[PDB]
Subunit: 61 residues, 3 copies
């Protein structure tokens, strides 16, 4: 019955391999943090400068 | 002592199952890249058009 | 030849441990969804309010 336990572990390993394979695919569809950071910084900067110009225009009208 | 090595692998498999389970939970809390892409594109478009209107308003004042 | 199969599983477990270790590193470089959500909400709000002020300024010029 060590055969019995080795079967058991054979099948657990098989399932783990499939689980890991699918997680790997899930991961590659997730966004990089550096990509979030860079895009948001760019947008934040453009929005900030727009706020200032709008502010200046309010003082002229 | 093949029993000894089969114990060893039993416990490594147990730990792997728990590791994989927790990574699965971590993954489901991460942002999809398509979601980052779509939101940023929308914001980028709105900001671009705002820049143009602000530009036009500067030429009128 | 149960030794033979136990070798086989020993090496599959070894490879899985390395695979899981590297995925764990990949995961920690991905963006949290709540972080995407919060940053985009903030930017969306600022853009919305800019659109309104720009709209109001167009009616004054």
């Amino acid at each position: 019955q060590l055969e019995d336990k080795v079967e058991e572990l054979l099948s657990k390993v098989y399932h783990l391999e499939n689980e890991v394979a699918r997680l790997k695919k899930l991961i590659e569809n997730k966004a990089d943090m550096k990509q979030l950071e860079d895009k948001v910084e760019e947008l934040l900067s453009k929005v900030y400068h727009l706020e200032n110009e709008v502010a200046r225009l309010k003082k002229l009208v």
